[PDB]
Design a protein around this ligand. Structure first.
Ligand code: HEM
Ligand SMILES: CC1(C)[C@H]2CC(=O)[C@]1(C)C[C@H]2O
Ligand SMILES: [K+]
Length: 405
């Protein structure tokens, strides 16, 4: 239901958008969010859903807010408030100056030098999974590739057993698209419960895995504490288990529905890096926010200290004012503008791993399975949250049109 309208919010700014169950979700989750950018809607609106919060609907305001960390703090970055308050991951729950020291440590496990390290294991696993699917002429892409590929890469990088994936995937699901079986705080508690003994073991007997690197690392000189290491590893788990996993399904659903864009990439494989970028814009999928540190007049709207503001990273690139014809996918876009990996001091540290996983998937899938479609009669359902997603993606192809390499 709807929270009572606070006294300082004018009535002409009310627009009751539900980020966990938007009205037009049946048309596609990105399209459902894009109703916030129709001609009747102001640049900054208030929704009474999920406890009541502001929403910035346009790339210009979203970028400005993410840059101004003095007014828009990441101390409480999730809606609803009880989730944002419980949220204490590092570095995301910190503002500069304190935040920055932890980014260098995190960069040690997912930074560009490390991604070049994993280059061939990433390639090897993608090829292995796709060739296993190729003769079947069908798959459930979410379960058969979108989950195993990024998650098994992350679990190897973190030195965690693959048998733990269903448990951990359940918990990160509850932090991003809750089904109501757990609050965010309970899921976060359960994630830390998993991590605490592992952190302890790898500070006594350190190794070469990402948890060992974070847990034995230094933070601008001084040792990291066990608690900080846990709060960093929690974040890396969510990123490894929820981001590329869900993005790959949006991308493959689009290609399965658009033979012309497929053929363009088969005909012209060197455009695949650019296509990755244009797909990251069109099927952007993260939406978090900030909390006001003081009363502040922002673009002619009076924001109050403690107000939460959703700053949908998803919406910047779908904004017609940043990209003409924003809902159309054009691999030859001159200037692809988006904030899919965030903006400001919290720019995604995993984005280099993410791009490699996406580009390797596209190259290696189209090589072996150039021609595929949605299974006949299937209605693809999307789900909305902090990270939006695809419920299921049944694909079909003629094994005779395929190639083993
Ligand atoms: C398509 C894939 C991905 C997308 C769209 C994405 C998106 C984002 C966004 C929007 C933020 C900024 C959050 C904010 O400002 O509140 C972020 C931060 C971050 N992401 Fe990613 N992410 C992706 C993949 C990953 C992966 C695979 C990892 C692996 C560990 C990762 C690690 C991080 C970290 C550590 C931060 C925090 C940086 C900081 O707070 O200083 N990301 N991501
Ligand atoms: C918003 C995020 C997607 C981003 C920062 C978070 O807390 C995430 C949920 C995981 C990481 O990639
Ligand atoms: K918090």
């Amino acid at each position: 239901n709807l929270a009572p309208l606070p006294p300082h919010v004018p009535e002409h700014l009310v627009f009751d958008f539900d980020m966990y169950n938007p009205s037009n979700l049946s048309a596609g989750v990105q399209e459902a969010w894009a109703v916030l950018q129709e001609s009747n809607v102001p640049d900054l609106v208030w929704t009474r859903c999920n406890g009541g919060h502001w929403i910035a609907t346009r790339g210009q305001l979203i970028r400005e807010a993410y840059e101004d960390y003095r007014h828009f703090s990441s101390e409480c970055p999730f809606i609803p408030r009880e989730a944002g308050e419980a949220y204490d991951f590092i570095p995301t729950s910190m503002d500069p100056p304190e935040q920055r020291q932890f980014r260098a440590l995190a960069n040690q496990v997912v930074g560009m030098p490390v991604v070049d390290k994993l280059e061939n294991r990433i390639q090897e696993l993608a090829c292995s999974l796709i060739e296993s699917l190729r003769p079947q002429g069908q798959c459930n892409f979410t379960e058969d590739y979108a989950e195993p590929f990024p998650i098994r890469i992350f679990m190897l990088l973190a030195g965690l057993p693959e048998e733990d994936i269903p448990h951990l995937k359940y918990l990160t699901d509850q932090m991003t698209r809750p089904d109501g079986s757990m609050t965010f705080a309970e899921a976060k508690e359960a994630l830390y419960d998993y991590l605490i003994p592992i952190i302890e073991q790898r500070r006594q007997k350190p190794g070469t895995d990402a948890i060992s690197i974070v847990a034995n690392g230094q933070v601008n000189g001084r040792p990291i504490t066990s608690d900080e290491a846990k709060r960093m590893c929690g974040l890396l788990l969510v990123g490894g288990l929820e981001t590329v996993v869900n993005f790959l399904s949006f991308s493959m659903e689009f290609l399965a529905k658009s033979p012309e864009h497929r053929q363009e990439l088969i005909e012209r494989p060197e455009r695949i890096p650019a296509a990755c970028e244009e797909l990251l814009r069109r099927f952007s999928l993260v939406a978090d926010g900030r909390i006001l540190t003081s009363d502040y007049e922002f673009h002619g709207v009076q924001l109050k200290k403690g107000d939460q503001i959703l700053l949908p990273q998803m919406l910047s690139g779908l904004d017609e004012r940043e990209n003409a014809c924003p809902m159309h996918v054009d691999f030859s876009r001159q200037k692809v503008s988006h904030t899919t990996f965030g903006h400001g001091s919290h720019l995604c540290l995993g984005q280099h791993l993410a791009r490699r996983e996406i580009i390797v998937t596209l190259k290696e899938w189209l090589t072996r399975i150039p021609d595929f479609s949605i299974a006949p009669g299937a209605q693809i359902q999307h789900k909305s949250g902090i990270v939006s997603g695809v419920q299921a993606l049944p694909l079909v192809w003629d094994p005779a049109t395929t190639k083993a390499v």
